[PDB]
Amino acid sequence: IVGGYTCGANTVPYQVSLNSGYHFCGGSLINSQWVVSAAHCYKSGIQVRLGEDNINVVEGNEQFISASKSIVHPSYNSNTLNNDIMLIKLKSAASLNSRVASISLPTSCASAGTQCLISGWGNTKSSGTSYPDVLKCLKAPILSDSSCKSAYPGQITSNMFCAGYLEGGKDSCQGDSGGPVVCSGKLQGIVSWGSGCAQKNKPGVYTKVCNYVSWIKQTIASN
Numbered sequence: 001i002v003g004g005y006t007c008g009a010n011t012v013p014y015q016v017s018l019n020s021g022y023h024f025c026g027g028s029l030i031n032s033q034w035v036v037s038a039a040h041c042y043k044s045g046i047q048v049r050l051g052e053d054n055i056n057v058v059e060g061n062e063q064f065i066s067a068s069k070s071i072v073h074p075s076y077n078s079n080t081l082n083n084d085i086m087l088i089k090l091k092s093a094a095s096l097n098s099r100v101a102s103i104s105l106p107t108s109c110a111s112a113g114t115q116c117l118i119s120g121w122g123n124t125k126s127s128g129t130s131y132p133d134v135l136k137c138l139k140a141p142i143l144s145d146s147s148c149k150s151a152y153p154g155q156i157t158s159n160m161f162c163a164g165y166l167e168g169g170k171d172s173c174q175g176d177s178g179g180p181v182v183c184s185g186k187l188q189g190i191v192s193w194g195s196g197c198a199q200k201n202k203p204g205v206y207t208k209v210c211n212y213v214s215w216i217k218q219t220i221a222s223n
């Protein structure tokens, strides 16, 4: 996250770290046994780490649970990043409480102008690299379909939205991928892609979760 603030330990109780020996992507807990992330984060051998604030230090609230199954969206296209979403089933159900909690799925798509909270342990610089050990947060508005398409001509599909600031300086970045964009207490987006981080006229692009709610519910109902 570039130009955000320190969230505070366990203030984002649905935030997940995906670990394969090191943190490589975020995710969101949507019920005690399922995590949603970006399909471009797919890897074999994932361990889900819940209750994290400092990812390099055991502070007492975490639960580490291995994934038993990963299901990438049937139409994920790795070249265009269309349908960049995947579900991960946990080997055991997590124990939910105030500090690790699930986020609910949306009943409606959020509109442009809605303020959201984006979080993750990704890079904090737009030039150079510095990975924080504690969770970072950014409040940012969903941008209009038109400004999003003008910033990325010929690349935005109906399954994507832009969020952030056209003047730059504040954005999600590498390592934040797969993480949550929550607006009005509901998961509306997944950190998916962008051109650099925090550059002028290149806002972050996010998977539009409201288009996938039927696929998520049907899939978790039979797996």
Ligand SMILES: *P(=O)(O)[C@@H](NC(=O)OCc1ccccc1)c1ccc(C(=N)N)cc1
Pocket (backbone or CB within 6 Å): 040, 081, 122, 171, 172, 173, 174, 175, 176, 177, 178, 191, 192, 193, 194, 195, 196, 197, 198, 203, 204, 205
């Ligand atoms: P994420 O993996 O942390 C990163 N996206 C990623 O690199 O995959 C998509 C991609 C591939 C090749 C070039 C560009 C993008 C990511 C997530 C968000 C932003 C952002 N500026 N908001 C940037 C990179």
Ligand SMILES: [Ca+2]
Pocket (backbone or CB within 6 Å): 052, 053, 054, 055, 056, 057, 058, 059, 062
């Ligand atoms: Ca920790």
